[PDB]
Amino acid sequence: MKELIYIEEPKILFAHGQKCTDARDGLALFGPLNNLYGIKSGVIGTKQGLK
Amino acid sequence: MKELIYIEEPKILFAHGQKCTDARDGLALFGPLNNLYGIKSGVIGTKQGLK
């Protein structure tokens, strides 16, 4: 018989010094680290692509 | 006795589609034209410069 070992989950960090094992859950619960104000986007393409 | 002619002020435009004559008053009554979200800044210099 061969023997296996287990390794625990490492956990990741989010806003307010809160730890979670998932990024989706930690983002929906706490939020990201830094503070952006807003994304200004440039769109290059056809008309239907822009729509 | 030569004659002088007078030319009216051209006026400059602001937010809300509002025309004024002085830039200072038109920035403190209707604000700028485009809509940013905030200015992220970089500083290069000594410690006193950052202070």
Side-chain angles (χ1 to χ4, degrees):
Chain A
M1 191 75 78
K2 304 294 177 191
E3 196 266 334
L4 304 179
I5 57 156
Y6 184 63
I7 303 174
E8 296 290 336
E9 278 268 29
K11 260 159 188 291
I12 48 177
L13 196 58
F14 297 99
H16 308 309
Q18 298 303 290
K19 297 166 184 196
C20 194
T21 42
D22 206 344
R24 291 86 52 94
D25 279 349
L27 275 173
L29 288 161
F30 306 124
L33 295 164
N34 66 332
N35 186 8
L36 294 178
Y37 300 111
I39 292 161
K40 282 176 287 260
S41 79
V43 181
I44 172 167
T46 50
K47 278 295 308 204
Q48 71 152 353
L50 167 78
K51 190 178 182 265
Chain B
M1 284 292 293
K2 337 288 191 171
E3 308 271 340
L4 295 156
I5 68 174
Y6 156 82
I7 306 165
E8 284 283 358
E9 213 53 47
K11 299 157 86 89
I12 58 171
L13 179 60
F14 303 112
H16 310 316
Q18 289 281 281
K19 295 165 173 186
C20 170
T21 289
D22 193 57
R24 287 87 57 95
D25 284 345
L27 282 165
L29 284 179
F30 323 106
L33 272 174
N34 74 324
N35 169 44
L36 305 182
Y37 298 112
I39 304 168
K40 288 173 277 270
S41 58
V43 192
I44 181 168
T46 72
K47 282 301 303 196
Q48 289 72 13
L50 195 64
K51 178 148 217 290

Coordinates of all heavy atoms in Angstrom, one line a residue:
Chain A
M1 N 0.8 -1.2 0.0 CA 0.0 0.0 0.0 C 0.9 1.3 0.0 O 1.8 1.4 0.8 CB -0.9 0.0 1.2 CG -2.0 1.1 1.1 SD -3.3 0.7 0.0 CE -4.3 -0.5 0.9
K2 N 0.5 2.2 -0.9 CA 1.2 3.5 -1.0 C 0.4 4.6 -0.2 O -0.8 4.5 -0.2 CB 1.4 3.9 -2.4 CG 2.2 2.8 -3.2 CD 3.6 2.7 -2.7 CE 4.3 1.6 -3.5 NZ 5.6 1.2 -2.9
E3 N 1.1 5.5 0.4 CA 0.6 6.5 1.3 C 0.5 7.9 0.6 O 1.5 8.3 0.0 CB 1.4 6.5 2.6 CG 0.7 7.2 3.7 CD 1.1 8.7 3.8 OE1 2.2 9.1 3.4 OE2 0.3 9.5 4.4
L4 N -0.6 8.5 0.7 CA -0.8 9.9 0.1 C -0.8 10.9 1.2 O -1.1 10.6 2.4 CB -2.1 9.9 -0.7 CG -2.3 8.9 -1.9 CD1 -3.7 9.2 -2.5 CD2 -1.2 9.1 -2.9
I5 N -0.5 12.1 0.8 CA -0.5 13.3 1.8 C -1.4 14.3 1.2 O -1.7 14.4 0.0 CB 0.9 13.8 2.0 CG1 1.6 14.3 0.7 CG2 1.8 12.8 2.7 CD1 2.6 15.3 0.8
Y6 N -1.9 15.2 2.1 CA -2.8 16.3 1.8 C -2.2 17.6 2.0 O -1.4 17.8 2.9 CB -4.1 16.2 2.6 CG -5.2 17.2 2.2 CD1 -5.7 17.2 0.9 CD2 -5.6 18.2 3.1 CE1 -6.7 18.1 0.5 CE2 -6.5 19.1 2.7 CZ -7.1 19.1 1.4 OH -8.0 20.0 1.1
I7 N -2.5 18.6 1.1 CA -2.0 19.9 1.2 C -3.1 20.9 1.3 O -4.0 20.8 0.4 CB -1.0 20.3 0.1 CG1 0.1 19.3 0.0 CG2 -0.5 21.7 0.2 CD1 1.1 19.4 -1.2
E8 N -3.1 21.8 2.2 CA -4.3 22.7 2.5 C -4.3 23.8 1.5 O -3.2 24.2 0.9 CB -4.2 23.2 3.9 CG -4.4 22.2 5.0 CD -5.8 21.6 5.0 OE1 -6.8 22.3 4.6 OE2 -6.0 20.5 5.5
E9 N -5.4 24.4 1.3 CA -5.6 25.5 0.4 C -4.8 26.8 0.8 O -4.7 27.0 2.0 CB -7.1 25.9 0.2 CG -7.8 25.0 -0.8 CD -7.8 25.5 -2.2 OE1 -6.9 26.2 -2.6 OE2 -8.8 25.2 -2.9
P10 N -4.2 27.5 -0.1 CA -3.3 28.6 0.3 C -4.0 29.9 0.7 O -3.4 30.7 1.4 CB -2.5 28.8 -1.0 CG -2.7 27.6 -1.8 CD -4.1 27.2 -1.5
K11 N -5.2 30.2 0.2 CA -6.0 31.4 0.5 C -5.4 32.6 -0.2 O -4.2 32.8 -0.3 CB -6.1 31.6 2.0 CG -7.4 31.2 2.6 CD -7.3 31.0 4.1 CE -8.6 30.4 4.6 NZ -9.7 31.3 4.6
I12 N -6.3 33.6 -0.6 CA -5.9 34.8 -1.3 C -6.5 36.0 -0.5 O -7.4 35.8 0.3 CB -6.2 34.8 -2.8 CG1 -7.7 34.4 -3.0 CG2 -5.3 34.0 -3.6 CD1 -8.2 34.5 -4.4
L13 N -5.9 37.2 -0.8 CA -6.2 38.3 0.0 C -7.0 39.4 -0.8 O -6.9 39.5 -2.0 CB -5.0 39.0 0.6 CG -5.1 40.0 1.7 CD1 -5.8 39.4 2.9 CD2 -3.8 40.6 2.1
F14 N -7.9 40.1 -0.1 CA -8.8 41.1 -0.7 C -8.8 42.3 0.1 O -7.9 42.5 1.0 CB -10.2 40.5 -0.8 CG -10.3 39.3 -1.7 CD1 -10.4 38.1 -1.2 CD2 -10.4 39.5 -3.1 CE1 -10.5 37.0 -2.0 CE2 -10.5 38.4 -3.9 CZ -10.5 37.1 -3.4
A15 N -9.7 43.2 -0.1 CA -9.8 44.5 0.6 C -10.2 44.3 2.1 O -10.8 43.3 2.4 CB -10.8 45.4 -0.1
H16 N -9.8 45.2 2.9 CA -10.0 45.2 4.3 C -9.3 44.1 5.0 O -9.7 43.6 6.1 CB -11.5 45.2 4.7 CG -12.3 46.3 4.0 ND1 -11.9 47.6 4.0 CD2 -13.4 46.2 3.3 CE1 -12.8 48.3 3.3 NE2 -13.7 47.5 2.9
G17 N -8.2 43.6 4.4 CA -7.4 42.5 5.1 C -8.2 41.2 5.3 O -8.0 40.6 6.3
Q18 N -9.1 40.9 4.4 CA -9.9 39.7 4.5 C -9.4 38.6 3.6 O -9.1 38.9 2.4 CB -11.4 40.0 4.2 CG -12.0 41.1 5.2 CD -11.9 40.6 6.6 OE1 -12.5 39.7 7.1 NE2 -11.0 41.3 7.4
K19 N -9.4 37.4 4.1 CA -8.9 36.3 3.3 C -10.0 35.4 2.8 O -11.0 35.2 3.5 CB -7.9 35.4 4.1 CG -6.6 36.2 4.5 CD -5.9 35.5 5.6 CE -4.7 36.3 6.1 NZ -3.7 35.5 6.9
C20 N -9.8 34.8 1.6 CA -10.8 33.9 1.1 C -10.1 32.9 0.2 O -9.0 33.1 -0.3 CB -11.9 34.6 0.3 SG -13.4 33.6 -0.1
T21 N -10.7 31.7 -0.1 CA -10.2 30.7 -1.0 C -10.6 30.9 -2.4 O -10.0 30.3 -3.3 CB -10.5 29.3 -0.5 OG1 -11.9 29.3 -0.1 CG2 -9.6 28.9 0.6
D22 N -11.6 31.7 -2.6 CA -12.2 32.0 -4.0 C -12.0 33.5 -4.3 O -12.1 34.3 -3.4 CB -13.6 31.6 -4.1 CG -14.0 31.2 -5.5 OD1 -13.3 31.6 -6.4 OD2 -15.1 30.6 -5.7
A23 N -11.8 33.8 -5.6 CA -11.7 35.1 -6.0 C -13.0 35.8 -6.3 O -13.3 37.0 -6.0 CB -10.8 35.2 -7.3
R24 N -14.0 35.0 -6.9 CA -15.3 35.5 -7.1 C -16.0 35.9 -5.8 O -16.6 36.9 -5.7 CB -16.1 34.4 -7.9 CG -15.6 34.2 -9.3 CD -14.5 33.2 -9.4 NE -14.8 31.9 -8.8 CZ -15.3 30.9 -9.4 NH1 -15.6 30.9 -10.7 NH2 -15.5 29.8 -8.7
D25 N -15.9 35.0 -4.8 CA -16.6 35.2 -3.6 C -16.0 36.4 -2.8 O -16.7 37.3 -2.3 CB -16.5 34.0 -2.7 CG -17.6 33.0 -3.0 OD1 -18.5 33.4 -3.8 OD2 -17.6 31.9 -2.5
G26 N -14.6 36.5 -2.8 CA -13.9 37.6 -2.2 C -14.2 38.9 -2.9 O -14.1 40.0 -2.2
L27 N -14.4 38.9 -4.2 CA -14.6 40.1 -4.9 C -16.1 40.6 -4.7 O -16.4 41.8 -4.6 CB -14.4 39.9 -6.4 CG -12.9 40.2 -6.8 CD1 -12.7 39.8 -8.3 CD2 -12.5 41.6 -6.6
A28 N -17.0 39.6 -4.6 CA -18.4 40.0 -4.3 C -18.6 40.4 -2.9 O -19.5 41.2 -2.6 CB -19.3 38.8 -4.7
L29 N -17.8 39.9 -2.0 CA -18.0 40.2 -0.5 C -17.2 41.5 -0.1 O -17.8 42.3 0.6 CB -17.5 39.0 0.3 CG -18.4 37.8 0.3 CD1 -17.6 36.6 0.8 CD2 -19.6 38.0 1.2
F30 N -16.0 41.6 -0.6 CA -15.1 42.6 0.0 C -14.6 43.7 -1.0 O -14.7 44.9 -0.7 CB -13.9 42.0 0.6 CG -14.2 40.9 1.6 CD1 -13.7 39.6 1.5 CD2 -15.0 41.2 2.7 CE1 -14.0 38.6 2.4 CE2 -15.3 40.2 3.6 CZ -14.8 38.9 3.5
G31 N -14.2 43.3 -2.2 CA -13.7 44.2 -3.2 C -12.2 44.1 -3.4 O -11.5 43.4 -2.7
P32 N -11.7 44.9 -4.4 CA -10.3 44.8 -4.7 C -9.4 45.7 -3.8 O -9.9 46.4 -3.0 CB -10.3 45.3 -6.2 CG -11.4 46.2 -6.3 CD -12.5 45.7 -5.3
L33 N -8.1 45.7 -4.1 CA -7.2 46.3 -3.2 C -7.2 47.9 -3.4 O -7.4 48.6 -2.5 CB -5.8 45.8 -3.4 CG -5.5 44.3 -3.0 CD1 -4.2 43.8 -3.6 CD2 -5.5 44.1 -1.5
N34 N -6.9 48.3 -4.7 CA -6.7 49.7 -5.0 C -8.0 50.3 -5.4 O -9.1 49.7 -5.5 CB -5.7 49.8 -6.1 CG -6.1 49.3 -7.4 OD1 -6.9 48.4 -7.5 ND2 -5.6 49.8 -8.5
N35 N -8.0 51.6 -5.6 CA -9.2 52.4 -5.9 C -9.0 53.1 -7.2 O -8.4 54.2 -7.3 CB -9.4 53.5 -4.8 CG -10.7 54.3 -4.9 OD1 -11.5 53.9 -5.8 ND2 -10.8 55.3 -4.1
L36 N -9.5 52.5 -8.3 CA -9.7 53.2 -9.5 C -10.9 54.1 -9.5 O -11.8 53.9 -8.6 CB -9.8 52.2 -10.7 CG -8.6 51.3 -11.1 CD1 -8.9 50.4 -12.2 CD2 -7.4 52.2 -11.4
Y37 N -11.0 55.1 -10.4 CA -12.1 56.0 -10.4 C -13.1 55.6 -11.5 O -14.3 55.9 -11.4 CB -11.6 57.4 -10.6 CG -10.8 57.9 -9.4 CD1 -9.4 58.1 -9.6 CD2 -11.3 58.1 -8.2 CE1 -8.6 58.6 -8.6 CE2 -10.5 58.5 -7.1 CZ -9.1 58.8 -7.4 OH -8.3 59.2 -6.3
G38 N -12.6 55.1 -12.7 CA -13.4 54.8 -13.8 C -12.6 54.5 -15.0 O -11.5 55.0 -15.2
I39 N -13.1 53.6 -15.9 CA -12.4 53.1 -17.1 C -12.9 53.9 -18.2 O -14.1 53.9 -18.6 CB -12.6 51.6 -17.3 CG1 -11.9 50.8 -16.2 CG2 -12.1 51.2 -18.6 CD1 -12.4 49.4 -16.1
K40 N -12.0 54.7 -18.9 CA -12.3 55.4 -20.1 C -11.7 54.5 -21.3 O -10.5 54.3 -21.3 CB -11.7 56.8 -20.2 CG -12.5 57.8 -19.4 CD -11.8 59.1 -19.4 CE -10.5 59.1 -18.5 NZ -10.8 59.7 -17.1
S41 N -12.6 54.0 -22.2 CA -12.2 53.0 -23.1 C -12.2 53.6 -24.5 O -13.1 54.5 -24.9 CB -13.2 51.8 -23.1 OG -14.4 52.1 -23.8
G42 N -11.3 53.2 -25.4 CA -11.2 53.5 -26.8 C -11.6 52.3 -27.6 O -11.0 51.2 -27.4
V43 N -12.6 52.4 -28.5 CA -13.1 51.3 -29.3 C -12.8 51.6 -30.7 O -13.2 52.6 -31.3 CB -14.6 51.2 -29.1 CG1 -15.1 50.0 -29.9 CG2 -14.9 51.0 -27.6
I44 N -12.0 50.7 -31.3 CA -11.7 50.8 -32.8 C -12.3 49.5 -33.4 O -12.0 48.4 -33.1 CB -10.2 50.8 -33.0 CG1 -9.8 50.7 -34.5 CG2 -9.4 49.8 -32.1 CD1 -8.4 51.0 -34.8
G45 N -13.1 49.8 -34.4 CA -13.8 48.7 -35.1 C -14.9 49.3 -36.1 O -15.0 50.5 -36.2
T46 N -15.6 48.4 -36.7 CA -16.7 48.7 -37.5 C -17.9 49.3 -36.7 O -17.8 49.5 -35.5 CB -17.2 47.5 -38.3 OG1 -17.5 46.4 -37.5 CG2 -16.2 47.1 -39.4
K47 N -18.9 49.7 -37.4 CA -20.1 50.3 -36.7 C -20.9 49.3 -35.9 O -21.2 49.5 -34.8 CB -21.0 51.0 -37.8 CG -20.5 52.4 -38.2 CD -20.6 53.4 -37.0 CE -22.0 53.4 -36.4 NZ -22.2 54.7 -35.7
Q48 N -21.1 48.1 -36.5 CA -21.9 47.1 -35.8 C -21.0 46.5 -34.7 O -21.6 46.2 -33.6 CB -22.2 46.0 -36.8 CG -21.1 45.1 -37.3 CD -21.5 43.7 -37.7 OE1 -22.7 43.3 -37.4 NE2 -20.6 42.9 -38.2
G49 N -19.7 46.5 -34.8 CA -18.9 46.1 -33.7 C -19.0 47.1 -32.5 O -19.0 46.7 -31.4
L50 N -19.0 48.4 -32.8 CA -19.2 49.4 -31.8 C -20.5 49.2 -31.1 O -20.6 49.3 -29.9 CB -19.1 50.8 -32.4 CG -19.5 52.0 -31.5 CD1 -18.5 52.3 -30.5 CD2 -19.9 53.2 -32.4
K51 N -21.6 49.0 -31.9 CA -22.9 48.8 -31.3 C -22.9 47.6 -30.4 O -23.5 47.6 -29.3 CB -24.0 48.7 -32.4 CG -25.4 48.7 -31.8 CD -26.5 48.6 -32.9 CE -27.9 48.7 -32.3 NZ -28.5 47.3 -32.2
Chain B
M1 N -9.4 114.0 -35.9 CA -10.5 113.4 -35.2 C -10.9 112.1 -35.9 O -12.0 112.0 -36.5 CB -11.7 114.3 -35.1 CG -11.6 115.4 -34.1 SD -11.6 114.7 -32.4 CE -13.2 114.1 -32.3
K2 N -10.0 111.1 -35.8 CA -10.3 109.8 -36.4 C -11.3 109.0 -35.6 O -11.5 109.4 -34.4 CB -9.0 109.0 -36.5 CG -7.7 109.8 -36.6 CD -7.5 110.5 -37.9 CE -6.2 111.1 -38.0 NZ -5.9 111.6 -39.4
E3 N -11.9 108.0 -36.1 CA -13.0 107.3 -35.5 C -12.5 105.9 -35.1 O -11.7 105.2 -35.8 CB -14.1 107.1 -36.5 CG -14.6 108.4 -37.1 CD -15.6 109.1 -36.3 OE1 -16.3 108.5 -35.5 OE2 -15.8 110.4 -36.5
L4 N -13.0 105.5 -33.9 CA -12.7 104.1 -33.4 C -14.0 103.3 -33.5 O -15.1 103.7 -33.3 CB -12.2 104.2 -31.9 CG -10.9 104.9 -31.7 CD1 -10.8 105.5 -30.3 CD2 -9.8 103.9 -32.0
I5 N -13.8 102.0 -33.7 CA -14.8 101.0 -33.7 C -14.6 100.0 -32.6 O -13.4 99.6 -32.3 CB -15.0 100.3 -35.1 CG1 -13.8 99.4 -35.4 CG2 -15.1 101.4 -36.2 CD1 -13.9 98.6 -36.7
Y6 N -15.6 99.5 -32.0 CA -15.6 98.6 -30.9 C -16.1 97.2 -31.3 O -17.1 97.1 -32.0 CB -16.3 99.1 -29.7 CG -16.8 98.1 -28.7 CD1 -15.9 97.6 -27.7 CD2 -18.1 97.6 -28.7 CE1 -16.3 96.6 -26.8 CE2 -18.5 96.6 -27.8 CZ -17.6 96.1 -26.8 OH -18.0 95.2 -25.9
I7 N -15.4 96.1 -30.8 CA -15.7 94.8 -31.1 C -16.2 94.0 -29.9 O -15.5 94.1 -28.8 CB -14.6 94.1 -31.8 CG1 -14.1 94.9 -33.0 CG2 -14.9 92.7 -32.2 CD1 -12.7 94.5 -33.5
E8 N -17.3 93.3 -29.9 CA -17.8 92.7 -28.7 C -17.0 91.4 -28.4 O -16.3 90.8 -29.2 CB -19.3 92.3 -29.0 CG -20.2 93.5 -28.9 CD -20.5 93.9 -27.5 OE1 -20.0 93.3 -26.5 OE2 -21.3 94.9 -27.3
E9 N -17.2 91.0 -27.1 CA -16.5 89.8 -26.6 C -17.1 88.6 -27.2 O -18.3 88.5 -27.5 CB -16.6 89.8 -25.1 CG -15.4 89.2 -24.4 CD -14.1 89.8 -24.8 OE1 -14.0 91.1 -24.8 OE2 -13.1 89.1 -25.1
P10 N -16.2 87.6 -27.5 CA -16.7 86.4 -28.3 C -17.4 85.3 -27.5 O -18.2 84.6 -28.2 CB -15.4 85.8 -28.9 CG -14.3 86.9 -28.6 CD -14.7 87.6 -27.4
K11 N -17.3 85.3 -26.2 CA -17.9 84.3 -25.3 C -17.4 82.9 -25.5 O -17.1 82.5 -26.7 CB -19.4 84.3 -25.5 CG -20.1 85.6 -25.2 CD -21.5 85.7 -26.0 CE -22.6 85.0 -25.2 NZ -23.3 86.0 -24.3
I12 N -17.3 82.1 -24.4 CA -16.8 80.8 -24.5 C -17.8 79.9 -23.8 O -18.6 80.3 -22.9 CB -15.4 80.6 -23.8 CG1 -15.4 81.1 -22.4 CG2 -14.4 81.4 -24.6 CD1 -14.1 80.8 -21.6
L13 N -17.9 78.6 -24.2 CA -18.9 77.7 -23.9 C -18.5 76.7 -22.8 O -17.3 76.4 -22.7 CB -19.4 77.0 -25.1 CG -20.5 75.9 -25.1 CD1 -21.8 76.5 -24.5 CD2 -20.7 75.3 -26.4
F14 N -19.5 76.1 -22.1 CA -19.2 75.2 -21.0 C -20.2 74.1 -20.9 O -20.9 73.8 -21.9 CB -19.3 76.1 -19.7 CG -18.3 77.2 -19.6 CD1 -18.8 78.5 -19.7 CD2 -17.0 77.0 -19.7 CE1 -17.9 79.6 -19.7 CE2 -16.1 78.1 -19.6 CZ -16.6 79.4 -19.6
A15 N -20.3 73.4 -19.8 CA -21.2 72.3 -19.6 C -22.6 72.9 -19.6 O -22.9 74.1 -19.5 CB -21.0 71.6 -18.3
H16 N -23.6 72.0 -19.8 CA -25.0 72.3 -19.9 C -25.4 73.2 -21.1 O -26.5 73.6 -21.3 CB -25.6 73.1 -18.6 CG -25.2 72.4 -17.4 ND1 -25.3 71.0 -17.2 CD2 -24.7 72.9 -16.2 CE1 -24.9 70.7 -15.9 NE2 -24.6 71.8 -15.3
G17 N -24.4 73.4 -22.0 CA -24.6 74.3 -23.2 C -24.8 75.7 -22.7 O -25.6 76.4 -23.3
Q18 N -23.9 76.2 -21.8 CA -24.0 77.5 -21.3 C -22.8 78.3 -21.7 O -21.7 77.9 -21.6 CB -24.1 77.5 -19.8 CG -25.4 76.9 -19.2 CD -26.5 77.9 -19.3 OE1 -26.6 78.8 -18.4 NE2 -27.4 77.8 -20.2
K19 N -23.1 79.5 -22.2 CA -22.1 80.4 -22.7 C -21.8 81.6 -21.7 O -22.8 82.2 -21.3 CB -22.4 81.0 -24.1 CG -22.5 80.0 -25.2 CD -23.3 80.6 -26.4 CE -23.2 79.7 -27.6 NZ -23.8 80.4 -28.8
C20 N -20.6 81.8 -21.4 CA -20.2 82.9 -20.5 C -19.1 83.7 -21.2 O -18.8 83.5 -22.4 CB -19.8 82.4 -19.1 SG -19.0 83.7 -18.1
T21 N -18.5 84.7 -20.5 CA -17.4 85.5 -21.0 C -16.1 85.3 -20.3 O -15.1 85.3 -20.9 CB -17.8 87.0 -20.9 OG1 -18.9 87.3 -21.9 CG2 -16.6 87.9 -21.2
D22 N -16.1 85.0 -19.0 CA -14.9 84.7 -18.2 C -14.8 83.2 -17.9 O -15.8 82.6 -17.6 CB -15.0 85.5 -16.9 CG -13.6 85.5 -16.2 OD1 -12.6 86.0 -16.8 OD2 -13.6 85.1 -15.0
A23 N -13.6 82.7 -18.1 CA -13.4 81.3 -17.9 C -13.6 80.9 -16.4 O -14.2 79.8 -16.1 CB -12.0 80.9 -18.4
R24 N -13.1 81.7 -15.5 CA -13.2 81.4 -14.1 C -14.7 81.3 -13.7 O -15.0 80.4 -12.9 CB -12.5 82.5 -13.3 CG -11.0 82.4 -13.3 CD -10.4 83.2 -14.5 NE -10.9 84.6 -14.4 CZ -10.2 85.6 -13.9 NH1 -9.0 85.4 -13.4 NH2 -10.7 86.8 -13.9
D25 N -15.5 82.2 -14.1 CA -16.9 82.2 -13.7 C -17.6 81.0 -14.4 O -18.5 80.4 -13.8 CB -17.6 83.5 -14.1 CG -17.2 84.6 -13.1 OD1 -16.7 84.3 -12.0 OD2 -17.5 85.8 -13.4
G26 N -17.3 80.7 -15.6 CA -17.9 79.6 -16.3 C -17.4 78.2 -15.9 O -18.0 77.2 -16.3
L27 N -16.3 78.1 -15.1 CA -15.9 76.9 -14.5 C -16.5 76.7 -13.1 O -16.7 75.6 -12.6 CB -14.4 76.8 -14.4 CG -13.7 76.4 -15.7 CD1 -12.2 76.7 -15.6 CD2 -13.9 75.0 -16.1
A28 N -16.9 77.8 -12.5 CA -17.6 77.8 -11.2 C -19.1 77.9 -11.2 O -19.7 78.0 -10.2 CB -17.0 78.9 -10.3
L29 N -19.7 77.9 -12.4 CA -21.1 77.9 -12.5 C -21.7 76.7 -13.2 O -22.8 76.3 -12.9 CB -21.6 79.2 -13.3 CG -21.6 80.5 -12.6 CD1 -22.0 81.7 -13.5 CD2 -22.4 80.5 -11.3
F30 N -20.9 76.1 -14.2 CA -21.4 75.0 -14.9 C -20.3 73.9 -15.0 O -20.7 72.7 -15.4 CB -21.8 75.3 -16.3 CG -22.6 76.7 -16.4 CD1 -21.9 77.8 -16.9 CD2 -23.8 76.8 -15.9 CE1 -22.6 79.0 -17.0 CE2 -24.5 78.0 -15.9 CZ -23.9 79.1 -16.5
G31 N -19.0 74.1 -14.7 CA -18.0 73.1 -14.7 C -17.5 72.8 -16.1 O -17.8 73.5 -17.1
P32 N -16.5 71.9 -16.2 CA -15.9 71.6 -17.5 C -16.8 70.9 -18.4 O -18.0 70.5 -18.1 CB -14.7 70.7 -17.0 CG -15.1 70.1 -15.8 CD -16.0 71.1 -15.1
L33 N -16.3 70.6 -19.6 CA -17.1 70.0 -20.7 C -17.2 68.5 -20.5 O -18.2 67.9 -20.3 CB -16.6 70.4 -22.0 CG -17.2 71.7 -22.7 CD1 -16.4 72.0 -24.0 CD2 -18.7 71.6 -22.9
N34 N -16.0 67.9 -20.7 CA -16.0 66.4 -20.6 C -16.0 65.9 -19.2 O -15.8 66.6 -18.2 CB -14.7 65.9 -21.4 CG -13.5 66.1 -20.5 OD1 -13.3 67.1 -19.8 ND2 -12.5 65.2 -20.7
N35 N -16.3 64.6 -19.1 CA -16.5 64.0 -17.8 C -15.4 62.9 -17.6 O -15.5 61.8 -18.1 CB -17.9 63.3 -17.7 CG -18.1 62.4 -16.5 OD1 -17.7 62.7 -15.4 ND2 -18.6 61.2 -16.7
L36 N -14.4 63.3 -16.8 CA -13.4 62.4 -16.3 C -13.9 61.7 -15.0 O -15.1 61.8 -14.7 CB -12.1 63.1 -16.1 CG -11.5 63.9 -17.2 CD1 -10.2 64.5 -16.8 CD2 -11.4 63.0 -18.4
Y37 N -13.1 60.9 -14.4 CA -13.4 60.2 -13.1 C -12.4 60.5 -12.0 O -12.8 60.3 -10.9 CB -13.5 58.7 -13.4 CG -14.5 58.3 -14.3 CD1 -14.2 57.8 -15.6 CD2 -15.9 58.5 -14.1 CE1 -15.1 57.4 -16.5 CE2 -16.8 58.1 -15.0 CZ -16.5 57.6 -16.2 OH -17.4 57.2 -17.1
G38 N -11.3 61.1 -12.3 CA -10.3 61.4 -11.3 C -8.9 61.3 -11.9 O -8.7 60.6 -13.0
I39 N -7.9 62.0 -11.3 CA -6.6 62.1 -11.8 C -5.6 61.3 -10.9 O -5.5 61.7 -9.7 CB -6.1 63.5 -12.0 CG1 -7.1 64.3 -12.8 CG2 -4.7 63.6 -12.5 CD1 -6.9 65.8 -12.8
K40 N -5.0 60.2 -11.4 CA -4.0 59.5 -10.7 C -2.6 60.2 -11.0 O -2.3 60.4 -12.2 CB -3.9 58.1 -11.0 CG -5.1 57.3 -10.4 CD -5.1 55.8 -11.0 CE -5.8 55.8 -12.3 NZ -7.3 55.5 -12.2
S41 N -1.8 60.5 -10.0 CA -0.7 61.3 -10.2 C 0.6 60.5 -9.8 O 0.6 59.6 -9.0 CB -0.7 62.6 -9.3 OG -0.9 62.2 -7.9
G42 N 1.7 60.9 -10.5 CA 3.0 60.4 -10.1 C 3.9 61.5 -9.7 O 3.8 62.6 -10.4
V43 N 4.7 61.3 -8.7 CA 5.6 62.4 -8.2 C 7.0 61.8 -8.3 O 7.3 60.7 -7.8 CB 5.2 62.8 -6.8 CG1 6.0 64.0 -6.4 CG2 3.7 63.0 -6.6
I44 N 7.9 62.6 -8.8 CA 9.4 62.3 -8.8 C 10.1 63.5 -8.2 O 9.9 64.6 -8.6 CB 9.9 62.0 -10.3 CG1 11.3 61.6 -10.3 CG2 9.6 63.2 -11.2 CD1 11.8 61.0 -11.6
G45 N 11.0 63.2 -7.3 CA 11.7 64.2 -6.6 C 12.3 63.7 -5.2 O 12.4 62.5 -5.1
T46 N 12.5 64.6 -4.3 CA 13.0 64.2 -3.0 C 11.8 64.1 -2.0 O 10.7 64.2 -2.4 CB 14.0 65.3 -2.5 OG1 13.3 66.5 -2.2 CG2 15.0 65.6 -3.5
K47 N 12.1 63.8 -0.8 CA 11.1 63.6 0.2 C 10.4 64.9 0.5 O 9.1 65.0 0.6 CB 11.7 63.1 1.5 CG 12.0 61.6 1.6 CD 10.8 60.8 1.3 CE 9.7 61.1 2.3 NZ 8.6 60.0 2.3
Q48 N 11.1 66.0 0.5 CA 10.5 67.4 0.7 C 9.6 67.7 -0.5 O 8.5 68.4 -0.2 CB 11.6 68.4 0.8 CG 12.3 68.4 2.2 CD 13.3 67.2 2.3 OE1 13.6 66.5 1.3 NE2 13.8 66.9 3.5
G49 N 9.9 67.3 -1.7 CA 9.0 67.5 -2.8 C 7.7 66.8 -2.6 O 6.6 67.4 -2.9
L50 N 7.7 65.6 -2.2 CA 6.5 64.8 -1.9 C 5.7 65.5 -0.8 O 4.5 65.6 -0.9 CB 6.8 63.4 -1.6 CG 5.5 62.5 -1.6 CD1 5.0 62.4 -3.0 CD2 5.8 61.1 -1.1
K51 N 6.4 66.0 0.2 CA 5.7 66.7 1.3 C 5.0 67.9 0.8 O 3.8 68.1 1.1 CB 6.7 67.0 2.4 CG 6.1 67.8 3.6 CD 6.9 67.5 4.8 CE 5.9 67.4 6.0 NZ 5.4 68.8 6.4

